[PDB]
Structure formats: C-alpha cells, structure tokens
Paper text:
Similar to human Dicer, the N-terminal helicase region forms the base of the L-shaped structure and the DUF283 domain is located at the corner of the L and just below the catalytic active core. The previously unmodelled linker between the DUF283 and Platform domains (DP-linker) in human Dicer is now well resolved in Dcr-2 as a structural element that interacts with the RNase IIIa domain through two α-helices and one β-strand. The Platform and PAZ domains surrounding the Connector helix sit at the top of the core processing region. The intrinsic RNase III dimer comprising the RIIIDa and RIIIDb domains is located in the centre of the molecule with the insertion domains (RIIIDai and RIIIDbi) sitting in symmetric positions. The C-terminal dsRBD interacts with the DP-linker and shields the RNase-activity centre. Compared with the apo state, the overall structures of Dcr-2–Loqs-PD complex undergo major conformational changes when interacting with the dsRNA substrate, especially on the helicase and DUF283 domains. Although we cannot conclude whether the dimerization is an in vitro artifact or whether it is physiologically relevant, this finding helped us to solve near-atomic high-resolution structures of Dcr-2–Loqs-PD in the apo and initial binding states under conditions without ATP.
In Drosophila, an RNase III enzyme Dicer-2 (Dcr-2), aided by its cofactor Loquacious-PD (Loqs-PD), has an important role in generating 21 bp siRNA duplexes from long double-stranded RNAs (dsRNAs). ATP hydrolysis by the helicase domain of Dcr-2 is critical to the successful processing of a long dsRNA into consecutive siRNA duplexes. Here six cryo-electron microscopy (cryo-EM) structures of Drosophila Dcr-2–Loqs-PD in apo and in complex with dsRNA substrate in the absence or in the presence of ATP were captured, illuminating the continuous conformational changes of Dcr-2–Loqs-PD after binding to dsRNA and translocating until forming the active dicing state and cleaving the dsRNA substrate into an siRNA duplex in the post-dicing state. Loqs-PD is a cofactor protein that comprises two dsRBDs that are responsible for recruiting siRNA precursor substrates for Dcr-2.
Author numbering:
A (entry chain B): 344 to 359
B (entry chain A): 1 to 1042, 1120 to 1149, 1169 to 1563, 1604 to 1722
Write the structure that this text describes.
C-alpha cells in the first residue's frame, strides 16, 4: 500500500 | 638514556617464525596479511627445489577450495617469489595423463597449485611421494570437516611414512562457517585433530582488533518494529501484467530454432536467448519485494539496456517484434515506477515538511523507524563527534539506500549540517558517480575521505565488514537480516567504541524466531573467546620478556680499564641503540633475533653441563660487523638466558671497537676523529680541521695567490756580449685570399717578422690558433733558435726602447705609472723585428729600430707648408702607415695601394660620380686645412685597422654593405701624415699581445707535462722525451661561445619461461651484439696503446672557464671527478672492509670534498700558474718589458696595511715623464711624495673602505680564484692523465697529490685495481647450501648476461639486511658501495670518450641521469632481477610490489612522465625504494669481483644500459632548468633559494592552482626543494586530471 503503519515518538528500544 | 623499543617485530613475522618451528593452524579475521604469511612460509621451506626427486628433491603444494582462489594464489606467488609455479585445477586435461609426465612436470615446476580433486587423484592412484614434499599449505581450512576432501587428504597422512611427512598449515579467516554453531569445543577439537597442529592467533592490543573483539561490548537492543506480510496493489498489478504477458508468450509462432536442453536433462527448457527475459522478470519480481521501487526502476533501466544489446545481437524480425513488445511492457513498468516516485513525494502543499513526511511514508516500517531514530539522534547533536555506518546485504541495496538517504538529507537541512551520505559496492559494478568508475579507486577515495573525517555515513553490502580498519563508529546500522555468525561478529567488532550503542532491526513476528538465535550467537562468541584465551598465542610466547625481571644476583656487570660499569640490564637497550646507528633503508631499524635452542642441540653443543638449563642464540643482522652467532651460557630461566646473551654480545661489540669507553655506540663524528691524523693531515697547516664545526656562511670562497711566470721567461733579459736566442714567429692565414682579405692575407706572408729574444732556450710549442676579423690564423714558433750575439750596450738599449715604443704607440698599452723594466726579473723577454740578412740567415733589422725610437707626433699642416714644402715621392707611401690628421688625429691608417693614375680632379669612383675629389674634400672640409696645392698628383687606397687586442673569438662582425663601404677609402697623400713605418710589420705586431698571452701558459703546460711524465716514469719513452712533436691546439667547438582462462593459458608458456622471461618482443627504439671496448680500458692492460701526453690537453686543463678562451677545462673535470671517486671508493674498501656502508660513504665524500682537493692542491704549488682571468690587455695586463716604478713596488711589498689602501686614482696621480719612464726607472722624489700623501687622503674621502685589490691586483702579481676552480683543476689533471695513460698508470699519481696514503709495507696503490671484497677465506663452506639459497640462479645469470664462477658473490649481492637465514655472507650494501663507483666511472668514461658534440656541462647532467637511483630501479625491475632479493620486511614488500606494478603498467618505459617527479619520494609517502636500485649496483660489483675483468664488466654494464644510453643521449632529461622552464607555461612564479645552514639547506616558494594558491616547500639538499615543488605540481595536475 506504500503507506505501511505510522509510528511516532511512542517507541521503545527494548533490551535483548 | 633508556630509549624504548616496544617489541617492534611484526605479528606477521612472529607468526611465520612460529610456523617454521612446528605445525599449526593460523586464524586471522583481517583479510590482508594471510597472503604475505603464506609467501613467507613458502619461502622458508623453499630450498631443495632444484634437486631432483630421485636424489631427494622436494616440492610444495597449495590447496584452495575454489579455482579463483587458486588463480589469485598463483598470481601472488609469481609476483612475490622466484619459484616456478604450476596451476592444476578441475578437469584441465589432467586426469588423462601418464605417470611419466607427472614426474616430468614435477621436474618442471617447483610449487604446484591446485584444488582437492586433482590432488586426491594425484596421490591415491598416481602416487607421488608425500615424503617428497616440502610444505603443504591450505586456504580456508575451516571448509574441511567430515567427508570434505580436505579431511581425506589429511587422513592420507596416516598411511604413509609418518617420519617423513611434510609441514601442513591451514590459513583461515573464520574458524566456523558462520551458518550455525553448536558444541564449539567438539568442533574445535575435531579441527585440531584434522590438521596436526594447534590454532594460533595474534592478540596484539595496538592495531589488530583481536583483543578488543572480546574485551569490549556496546549496549544491545532491537528496534522491535512491528511488521506484517508485505502487500501492495502495485505489486498485484505488476503480477497481473506479467500473467497477461505470459499467457500470450506461449504463441510466439516464431521460426524453427535449435532445441536447447538442460544440463541435468530433467525437462525441456527454452533457449537462453528466449529465457533471458523470463530470468530477468523473475529477478525483478524478487527485487521489488526486497529492494523497493527506486532500485526496481534502476534495475529495469539496466534490463532495458541489456535488452537493447541483445536486440542488436538479434536478427529475426518476429523475434524483434516480440522483443519490442517486451520492451514496451518494461518501459510501461518503468513509467509507472517513475510516475509513483514523482507523484507521491510532493502530493501536499507544505514542501518543507511534506518532503520529509513522504520519505517517512515511502520507507518500509523498518526504514521508517530507522529514519525517525536517526532524526531524534541528530536533532541537536554536534557534527564533531558523530559517525555511523549502514550494513546491508545486496550490492544494489547500497545505491537504493543512498538515493533514499539523499532524498532524506536534502529534505532536512538541520541534518545536512551534521550528516553526509555515501554508498559503496563491490562486484557487478554499476555507475556510482561521475568519477572513479573502477571499484578499487572508488573504494580508495571512499576510505581516505572517511578516515579524513569529511564524511560520517555510508552504506556497504558487508564490504567493510571484512575487517577494515576504518574509524570505530559509535553506532552501527544493520537494515538487512543478520542471520549469519561471522558477519554478525564482525559487525559487533565495528562497534568497538566504549559505551557505544547498537540496534537490531527485527520485526515483531520475526522477534520470537530470532531472540533464541541471538542467544546462541552470543554464547558461541563467548565460548570461542574463552577457547582461544588459553591457547599459546604470541603474548604467551617468550617474546614478552621486555619486563626485565630482577635476577641480577647470578649475572655480573662488566668494567674496563676506563672503569665504566656495564650493567647487564641495559644490554638490550644499548644493543638496540647500536642497531639504530648502523645504516638502514629507513624501513625501520633491524632488531637482533633471539631464537631459542632445542634441548637436543643444546646437548649437542654443550652436553651434560647445560642439562636442565636454557640457552639462547642472538643473530646479529648482517649489516653490523658481527656476523657469527653468540650462544648464551646456561642457566635456569629463559629471561636470564636472554640477558646473558645480550650482555655477552655487548662485551664482544666493545672488544672489537664499535663502542667507545662509555659503552655507547659511536657516531660518524667520533669515527672520523680516528682518521683525521691518517688521511686529512695536510689540513692542519691551513688553520682548518676535518671536524668542520661550522660550514656554509663562515666559509670564504675566494683566495689570493701570487702568479709566477714560467722558468723560461724568468731572468730572460738578453745580456751584452753573450749569446741570445731569437725565435721567429710565423703567422699562417687559413682563410682564402679574397679581395676583402687581400691586405690581411698578403701582409702576413712577408719574410719580415719579429722574434722573441731570450737568454734561455725555448722548448717546442704547439701551433697557435688565432681568430682575426677576416678569419682564422695559425701561428707557430720557430723550432730552431736563431742564435745571435749583442755587440754593445747601445744596441741593447735600442732594442729595449723599440720594445717599449711598440707597446706605447703602436698598441697603446700604456698607463702613467708604467716604466721600462730594465732589471732582469719575471717576464724579461723582448720582441725584436727580423729582416733578411746575408744569405738565408735572417739578421736584426737595425735600420728600422735606429730611426723609430718613438713615433713622431701626428703633426698637421697648414696650407702654407704644402706650397713651400716639396711634394713627397709616390714610392715613399707604398706599404706604409699614414694618418688622416685633419679628421682623426690618433688613428693610424694603413696604405694598401698607390694610385698614380688618379688625380684630385678625378670624379668619384662610384655612387657619387658627379663629385670630384677636390670638391668633395672642399665641401666636407676646407676649414683648418685651406685648399689643396697639388691638384694633379697621385692618390692612395687605404684600409682601416681593428682596435681589438684579444683574438680568441670565433664569431665575426663583417658585413657586405660594410665590405663595399671599406675599400672606397681614398685619401690625398699630402693631406695625411705618414710615419714611414712598414705596414706588414705593424699588422703583424697588432697580434703580439694574444700570442704572448697564450704562449705564457703554453710554457706552463709544457713544464707541467714534463714533470708529470718524469714522475710516471714514462719520459724515456720514444713518444715522450726529446723526440716529442707537439700537436696543434684543438678548438673545443662544443662550447656555446664557439572467465578469463585464455589469458592464463597463454601465460602458461611464460610460466614455463617463468617470471624471469624478459619479453624482448619490441625494442625500446619503438617508443616513437659485439661491444666496442673502451680505449682507456684497452690501454690499461696493454702498453701498446699508450698515447703521448699532449701539452694542448694540459693547457686546456689549466685555463678555467672564466677566461674567454676557445677551450674550456670543464670537460676533463667530469672524467677526473669520476676517476677520483672510483679510486677513493676502491681505496677505502680495500683499506677498511669491516666498516659499515655509512661511515665508508661519509669518508669517501670527505676525501672528494672541494676543501680537501683545494688543500691538497695548494701544497702542490700548481694553482699559482692558472689561466682564470679574461685577457683584457688595455687595462689589466702588464707587458714584459714594462713595469711599475721600483720604489713604488718596494713600498708596496713592505706595508700590507698601506698596500690595502692604494687606489687606481692614486696610481694615475703619479705623473711620469719620458725621462723617468725610460732612463731613471724609479719615480722622482717629488712625485713619490705627492703620491704617498695623496693616497692617504682616501681615508678622509668617500673612497675609504673600497675594494682596491680587485682593480689593481694585476699591477702586483696577485689574482683571486674561487675555491671551485682549484678542485676543478686537480680533477682535470687527473682526467687527462687517465685519458692518456689509462687507469693502470693514473692510480699511482694520486700518491703525488697525496690524496691516498702510500702504504710503506706494500706498493699496493698500484695493485688496488684487483683487491678483494673483504672476508672470503672464512666462507669456503660447501656450495650446496649456497645453491639452496640461490633458487633458479640460472635464469638470474641469463638475464644479467653473466655466469658466475663463484656463486658466493651473487648471494652476498642478493642479501637484504632484513634476512636472518643467511649466515655466510654479508649484506648487499658492502658490494653496492663498490658498484656505485664502478658503474659511475664506466659510464662517465664511455660518455666522455664517445660523445664529443655534446656540450660540456650537459655531460654532467647526462651522467647524473644515468646514475640516478630511479633509473637503477627501473633497470632492475625491467630485467626482473628483483624476484631474487632475500628480504623479510612487509612494508618494503608492498612498496616494492606497488613500484613493480607501476613500472610494468608503462612497459618499463623511461620516457619522462611521472616517476621522475616521484624522484622526490625516494629515501606523501615513499614510492621508490633504495634497496631495489642498490641491488643492481651490488650485482655489478659482484660481476666485477668474480672475473676481475674490467672489459667483461663493461660488456655486462653496456648490455644492461644500451637502451637508456641510446635514449638519454638523444635528449637528456634535466632537473634544474627543467623545473625552471616547464612551469612558466602558465606558472612563471618562482622564489630565491633561502640558505639555512642547518639540517635543511634550502627553501623555495612557489604557487599552486596555476597562480591563485601559494604553496612553499623546503629542502635538505639543493634539488630536494625543486623535487618537492615538482610533486606539488604533479598533485595539482592530478586535481586537473580529476
């Protein structure tokens, strides 16, 4: 769809 | 005092040293270096290759899994080693052979390269003895497990004789395949068992990343971006369009074509020309899901290009139409992609925000999180300390991500201040940019620009993950899936920065299937680390004993008679410092080896006394005078053994005098202090010393010497009543007797002449070349002296007064202070006219000299005198001298004809025929003369006389209009005053000064020749002695003032001819046999060709170039300089052979220094007789019978403080009358006073402190000669003796100049031409090992064109100092020292004897070009003699390889171009090594030493240098004027040379970028700054080229 999913500053770099 | 040497030995050298000790496996993640360690491990086991298998010969085996790897290994072995190489891969017709030809090819090839199948076939069923193999190295050994053929080949080792097995080592870059790793210990133990050796890996903490690979870790998180199955309606449309194309692609209804079948024969398939479009469509379908649509567009563009190429290849019309339909479909797809790209990105109004929003929407969710995380990371962070890098998996993905990141960065100007994009690809190159299309240059610019800090981001498809040493990025970007252990570990290693950050790009659906994966990957990394930690690596090796543990109790220090204490702890430091003192190629100093002895060898050399103890041996490098090994005494631990070994080595070094009493290595200044009293003794009496504390500015380059006349001229005044010798002078006109020269020609052949009257007999003199205005003149002095006797004193007075009159009036060489030199002193000879006497014996012409004591005054005549004085008879004017008093009082005018048929009433002769003589004279004159009385008498034709007195110039100034203008000179006889002097004698006397000046030095040359021949014991020869006929002087006209398997298959035959195969396909004559012996060499051995020493040569050697003479002394200077250099080199090599090359070169330079030559020529009393001042006679010449007043000279010679203030104006202050100047001689008391108080007024005037000497030196007998001319004189004399009598006689003349000390014990200064090279009796060991080192020496000798009787010299000439295995011969520097002089003289003599049209001075530039080190390197590489150099030094290895590649790229052309500009880059990093050039000189010295034949050595040298000797003579490259005139095409800006007088001598300024950029350089020598400017200009051209 070339739109994918919109994501914002509510992101996490979670530990392995 | 404790200089640090922190274990500088390379890890590669340490690994190779470990490998030769015992079997093992080496693992290095770094891509580079494995090839070099393989080359070294091959070279260590390389001996015994020449010997046949039947007699114990061995070979070497290479194993590579893939054929490309084998090809690269073969190329590397060819380029790096001098061994015959094979290449046997797959099914290249090898399995269909016979045992006999296997054996034959094993005979042919030494090292054989191949894969597993061919080797298993060779060993299993066509068995070659595994015991007949030297070394078997394998590459990527980690491929061999289980049933892999490496395992089988290793298992075959268990069947053959286990006591004769070869050495096996396995190179590897990764220990595990990287797919999946479980049970690490079991796999590593299995790999340990497979190859009978351990895994060895360096753990250096300096530049290898091995220890940091496991001692550091960054934070580890994943982005955890959500993601689902990718779906796109555009992809669905593409699939539907492809289906619509395919449902019609089954009815091509094309013509019949051959049926194509698959290799596996599974099913029928379409031909390649028909299935190529299907394959490309499938590839594009794969690419859209992985790459996107921009990469899809570029890929479909490439597909369109390939389709166009194929259609150009195609012919059928129906196929063309179907292909056109396919092209239309592809173009429609490309149009759709580009429409989407150009439409979605700017589908909103706010461009500044939408340009970024669309990219945040264009990107996949993974890339979306990537972009926003990078945005928030560089929201405000400074660009000073930020850098990161993107890892992908596909080459095209690099370009795709690059375009995406460009669109992103140009969208956000804030990140443009902090972020810079790039992209990098490997194989399958596509257009990356507008510059550096090739992958290698693109990547080179990549790495240099990234490491220079210009950029901070790039994308690579694991290109840089191989282990590149790029800057440690603080964060790592890995977009593509990371399911691979090796690239994961190397990517983590890319994040070695402390406290750095690392992200993982895994989807949420992909997370549960990759968390466990990252778990085993991390635990396997840890397990590999802890498995390698306990291995015996380099650190655990005894090489880390620099800690110098405290064990001084059981080892003692040393003290000498001086009492200085030698602490054994400092032994290593002082040995390293001494190793720093010895000369080196600037490729790092050489550290002594410390190889440990085995217990069996320890018992072999020592026995029970060393049981339970360790002993070490030091291998002092061959450069130092120590050559034998030193064995430490036994004790407990290895560290104490090393300490004792170093202490004993230091004691030995001190015992032999390499260290002073302070136990510190000596320097050059300390060493020359031991030679000052032996060689440079003569400097002491002049106030100077060889120490040379200060130089340059403090040097005074001018000195004053007292000139002396030849002994014949001294005290040569004729006496009264005693015999006197008159030598008639003959003048021979060589020009044709033209009417213009008729007066000049005829008057020179008259019997009347003048003779030099002497009290001393004169020797024979050469024929004198003179140049009048009309043409050349030949002058010779009569051999037989016409003996006469002076009757009375009055006759002598008349002679002397006539002599004075000639100079005073006819030549006008007069000054107020001149007086007749009545007393008998220097230059006391006289000139006397001669007339035909009784019979044919000429007698003195007393009639003329009685009536011509002084020329009558140029009296005029009023008109009254003519009408009252009788008219002179016409015959009185024939051949006389007249004067046109009414127009030019002082001009003497020569009568050449009488015209009795002409009257003053006659008209003009031409061009004014309307005018008569009377009216012409009365119109241009009439005042001060009245009218003419005799209007009917005769007339005279007269010709002008030149005022020149110097006749040493070939060029003329005659003009044709002048030629008619001159003979029209007609004068009235009664209106001119005649001296009644014979015109012929006048015209002969006008040449007297030049003749006298040249003879004044011809006498000196003759006396010097007599002395030299007397010393050389050749005076009794018939050529020399009283029978010598001097040859006429020679004019020096040269003076200005006078796959790709086809290539490898066609290279296979050259491999049989080896690398050593000199091409010779085309001669170097195309850029656009028997050798002639040297005459000097020919007459050196046989006395039949001993040419007599001509005095013209000596006269040429005396006259400096300052004078305007027709011949110069510079031409002999070149030969003399080269001969002196060779003699000094050979003399020093013979006398001192244990010295290293540096001190020998320094002492040789000191012997041939200008100061030494000047000081050793001053005591020779020679320079006082040099011709070095231009002969201007009217101002700076003292005639023989003419001198200064005796009282004035007596006062002059007694008061130097007063003699330094006498000025020329004070000299004309003297007013001498005829009485004082003629009879009395001494000046009058009144005038003497007036002068002495007039001259002292100079101090009270502006004349005080002036340089009076330079203007009045000629009056005293002094001259100022620059210091260069004296050394040039000594060199010229050396050169002329060498040319005439050869080396065999000219060697011993240096004893005359005391340059080389004569050995009282033996007259060896004559036999020095045949001296040996040093220590030779101790090297008479068996030649089998010498041959072992010299593998394939036959080809080396063939290319060099000389077969060595003794191979020892060849081995010594090929030994680089960085080579430990050689122990019988010294380094190559000792031989190179001699070879330098040998080559220099053999080329200088050749060019001097063979080239004569070349300008002297340009021969020096030619000689410099021939002897240039870059030229020597070019010659050595061209003949491919570099493969045989024995060296162990990495940086030297790649520099030599790069230089070889650069040379071969040009076909070994020596046509100017770039490397002559790179001459600056000799010893911007270096680009040409000195060892490569110097090995040729060493080989030349070896050739000479082996045969002792100078002629054969010349044969070899000429065969080497023939092409460049042809080319350079045709157009000689130059340096100084070259850099001066080549820049001025668009850069005429230069600067003066700034003399510094320090380590750096000169500095220069210039401009770059044509004119607008100013760049300046410096120089430790004169040409160094010019070469630096040349390389800056070259770099500017590279910018212009780029």
């Amino acid at each position: 769809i070339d739109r994918y999913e919109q994501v914002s500053k509510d992101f996490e770099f979670i530990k392995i | 005092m404790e200089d640090v040497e922190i274990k500088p030995r390379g890890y590669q050298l340490r690994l190779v040293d470990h490998l030769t000790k015992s079997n093992g496996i080496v693992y290095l993640p770094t891509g580079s270096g494995k090839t070099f360690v393989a080359i070294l491990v091959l070279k260590r086991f390389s001996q015994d290759f020449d010997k046949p298998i039947e007699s114990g010969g061995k070979r070497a085996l290479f194993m590579c899994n893939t054929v490309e790897l084998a090809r690269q290994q073969a190329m590397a072995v060819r380029r790096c080693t001098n061994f015959k190489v094979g290449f046997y891969v797959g099914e290249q017709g090898v399995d269909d052979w016979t045992r006999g030809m296997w054996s034959d090819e094993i005979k042919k090839n030494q090292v054989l390269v191949g894969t597993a199948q061919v080797f298993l076939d060779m060993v299993t069923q066509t068995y070659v003895a595994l015991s007949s193999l030297s070394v078997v190295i394998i590459d990527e050994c980690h491929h061999g497990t289980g049933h892999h053929p490496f395992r089988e080949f290793m298992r075959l080792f268990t069947i053959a004789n286990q006591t004769k097995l070869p050495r096996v080592v396995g190179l590897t870059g990764v220990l595990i395949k990287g797919n999946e790793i479980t049970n690490v210990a079991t796999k590593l133990k299995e790999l340990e068992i497979t190859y009978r050796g351990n895994i060895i890996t360096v753990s250096d903490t300096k530049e290898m990343e091995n220890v940091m690979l496991y001692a550091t870790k960054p934070t580890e998180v994943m982005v955890s971006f959500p993601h689902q199955e990718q779906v796109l309606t555009v992809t669905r449309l593409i699939s539907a369009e492809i289906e619509k194309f395919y449902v019609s692609l089954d009815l091509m209804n094309i013509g019949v074509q051959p049926i194509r079948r698959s290799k596996s024969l599974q099913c029928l398939r379409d031909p390649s020309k028909k299935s190529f479009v299907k394959q490309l469509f499938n590839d594009f379908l794969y690419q859209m899901k992985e790459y996107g649509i921009y990469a899809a567009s570029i890929a479909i563009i490439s597909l369109i290009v390939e389709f166009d190429i194929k259609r150009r290849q195609a012919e059928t019309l129906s196929v063309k139409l179907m292909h056109r339909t396919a092209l239309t479909l592809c173009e429609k797809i490309r149009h759709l992609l580009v429409q989407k790209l150009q439409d979605m990105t700017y589908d909103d109004d706010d461009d500044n925000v939408n340009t970024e929003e669309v990219i945040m929407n264009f990107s996949t969710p993974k890339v979306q999180r990537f972009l926003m995380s990078l945005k928030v990371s560089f929201a405000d962070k400074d660009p000073k300390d930020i850098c990161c890098l993107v890892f992908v998996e596909r080459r095209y993905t690099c370009k795709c991500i690059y375009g995406l990141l460009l669109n992103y960065i140009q969208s956000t100007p804030e990140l443009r201040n902090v972020l810079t994009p790039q992209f990098m690809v490997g194989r399958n190159n596509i257009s990356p940019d507008f510059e550096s299309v090739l992958e290698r240059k693109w990547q080179k610019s990549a790495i240099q620009q990234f490491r220079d800090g210009n950029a901070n981001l790039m994308i690579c498809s694991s290109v840089l993950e191989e282990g590149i040493d790029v800057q440690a990025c603080n964060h790592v970007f890995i977009l593509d899936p990371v399911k691979t252990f090796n690239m994961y570990v190397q990517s983590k290693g890319r994040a070695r920065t402390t406290e750095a950050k690392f992200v993982l790009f895994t989807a949420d659906k992909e997370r549960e299937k990759t968390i466990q994966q990252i778990y085993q990957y991390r635990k396997a990394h840890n397990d590999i680390a802890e498995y390698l930690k306990d291995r015996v690596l380099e650190k655990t090796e005894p090489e880390l004993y620099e800690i110098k543990g405290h064990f001084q109790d059981d080892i003692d220090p040393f003290t000498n008679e001086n009492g200085a204490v030698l602490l054994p702890n400092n032994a290593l430091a002082i040995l390293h410092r001494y190793c720093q003192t010895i000369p080196t190629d600037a490729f790092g100093f050489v550290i002594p080896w410390f190889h440990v002895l085995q217990e069996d060898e320890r018992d072999r050399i020592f026995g029970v006394s060393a049981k339970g103890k360790h002993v070490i041996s030091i291998n002092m490098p061959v450069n130092c005078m120590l050559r034998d090994t030193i064995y430490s005494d036994p004790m407990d631990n290895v560290k104490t053994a090393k300490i004792s070994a170093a202490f004993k080595a230091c004691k030995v070094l001190y015992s032999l005098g390499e260290l002073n009493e302070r136990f510190v290595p000596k320097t050059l200044k300390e060493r020359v202090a031991s030679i000052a009293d032996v060689h440079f003794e003569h400097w002491n009496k002049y106030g100077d010393s060889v120490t040379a504390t200060v130089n340059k500015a403090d040097k005074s380059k001018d000195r004053t010497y007292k000139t002396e006349c030849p002994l014949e001229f001294y005290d040569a005044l004729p006496r009264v009543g005693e015999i006197c010798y008159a030598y008639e002078i003959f003048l021979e006109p060589q020009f044709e007797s033209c009417e213009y020269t008729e007066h000049m020609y005829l008057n020179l052949q008259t019997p009347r002449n003048y003779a030099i009257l002497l009290r001393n007999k004169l020797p024979r003199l050469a024929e004198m070349p003179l140049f009048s205005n009309q043409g050349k003149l030949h002058v010779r002095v009569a051999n037989a002296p016409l003996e006469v006797i002076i009757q009375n004193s009055e006759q002598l007075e008349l002679l002397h007064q006539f002599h004075g009159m000639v100079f005073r009036d006819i030549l006008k060489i007069w000054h107020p202070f001149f007086v007749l030199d009545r007393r008998s002193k220097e230059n006391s000879y006289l000139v006397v006219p001669l007339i035909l006497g009784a019979g044919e014996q000429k007698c003195f012409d007393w009639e003329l000299m009685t009536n011509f004591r002084r020329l009558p005054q140029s009296h005029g005549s009023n008109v009254q005198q003519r009408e009252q004085q009788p008219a002179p008879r016409p015959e009185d004017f024939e051949g006389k001298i007249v004067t046109q008093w009414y127009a030019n009082y002082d001009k003497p005018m020569l009568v050449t004809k009488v015209h009795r048929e002409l009257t003053p009433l006659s008209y003009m002769e031409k061009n004014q025929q309307d005018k008569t003589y009377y009216e012409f004279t009365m119109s241009k004159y009439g005042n001060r003369i009245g009218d003419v009385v005799h209007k009917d008498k005769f007339m005279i034709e007269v010709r002008d006389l030149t005022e020149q007195l110097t006749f040493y110039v070939h060029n003329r100034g005659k003009f044709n209009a002048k030629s008619k203008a001159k003979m029209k000179v007609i004068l009235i006889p009664e209106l001119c005053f005649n001296f009644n002097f014979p015109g012929d004698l006048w015209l002969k006397l006008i040449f007297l000064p030049s003749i006298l000046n040249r003879m004044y030095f011809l006498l000196h040359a003759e006396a010097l020749r007599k002395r030299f021949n007397t010393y050389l014991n050749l005076h009794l020869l018939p050529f020399n002695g009283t029978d010598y006929m001097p040859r006429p002087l020679e004019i020096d006209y040269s003076l200005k003032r006078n796959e790709m398997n086809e290539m490898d298959f066609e290279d296979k035959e050259y491999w049989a001819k080896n690398q050593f195969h000199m091409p010779t396909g085309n001669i170097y004559g195309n850029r656009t046999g028997k050798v002639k012996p040297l005459l000097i060499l020919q007459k050196t051995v046989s006395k039949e060709h001993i040419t007599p020493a001509e005095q013209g040569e000596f006269l040429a050697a005396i006259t400096a170039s300052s004078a305007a003479d027709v011949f110069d002394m510079e031409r002999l200077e070149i030969l003399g300089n080269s001969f002196l250099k060779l003699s000094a080199t050979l003399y020093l090599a013979s006398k001192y052979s244990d010295w290293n090359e540096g001190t020998l070169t320094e002492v040789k330079s000191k012997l041939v220094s200008n100061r030494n030559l000047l000081f050793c020529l001053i005591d020779a009393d020679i320079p006082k007789t040099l011709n070095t001042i231009q002969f201007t006679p009217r101002y700076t010449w003292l005639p023989p019978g003419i001198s200064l007043p005796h009282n004035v000279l007596a006062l002059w010679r007694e008061n130097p403080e007063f003699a330094k203030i006498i000025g020329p104006h004070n000299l004309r202050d003297l007013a001498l009358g005829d009485e004082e100047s003629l009879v009395k001689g001494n000046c009058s008391d009144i005038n003497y006073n007036r002068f002495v108080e007039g001259c002292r007024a100079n101090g009270q005037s502006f004349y005080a402190g002036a340089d009076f000497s330079s203007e009045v030196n000629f009056c005293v007998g002094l001259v100022t000669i620059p210091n260069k001319v004296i050394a040039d004189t000594l060199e010229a004399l050396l050169g002329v003796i060498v040319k005439n009598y050869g080396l065999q006689h000219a060697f011993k003349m240096l004893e005359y100049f005391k340059i080389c000390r004569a050995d009282i014990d033996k007259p060896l200064t004559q036999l020095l031409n045949l001296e040996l090279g040093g220590k030779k009796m101790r090297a008479n060991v068996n030649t089998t090992e010498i041959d072992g080192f010299l593998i394939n020496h036959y080809y080396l000798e063939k290319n060099l064109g000389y077969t060595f009787k003794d191979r020892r010299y060849l081995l010594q000439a090929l030994t680089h100092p960085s080579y430990p295995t050689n122990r019988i011969t010294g380094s190559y520097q000792e031989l190179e020292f001699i070879g330098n002089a040998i080559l220099d003289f053999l080329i200088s003599a050749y060019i001097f004897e063979n080239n004569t049209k070349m300008n002297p001075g340009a021969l020096t530039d030619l000689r410099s070009a021939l002897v240039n080190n870059t030229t020597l390197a070019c010659i050595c590489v061209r003949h491919r003699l570099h493969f045989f150099i024995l060296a162990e030094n990495a940086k030297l290895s790649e520099i030599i390889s790069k230089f070889v590649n650069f040379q071969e790229s040009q076909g070994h052309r020596v046509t100017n171009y770039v490397r002559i500009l790179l001459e600056e880059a000799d010893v911007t990093n270096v680009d040409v090594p000195k060892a490569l050039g110097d090995v040729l000189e060493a080989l030349i010295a070896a050739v000479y030493l082996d045969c002792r034949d100078l002629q054969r050595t010349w044969e070899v040298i000429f065969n080497l240098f023939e092409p460049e000797l042809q080319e350079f003579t045709r157009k000689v490259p130059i340096n100084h004027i070259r850099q001066l005139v080549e820049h001025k095409h668009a850069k005429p800006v230069f600067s003066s040379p700034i003399v510094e007088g320090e380590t750096v001598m000169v500095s220069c300024q210039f401009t770059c970028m044509e004119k607008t950029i100013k760049v300046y350089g410096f120089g430790s020598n004169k040409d160094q700054a010019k070469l630096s400017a040349a390389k800056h200009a070259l770099q500017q051209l590279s910018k212009c080229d780029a």
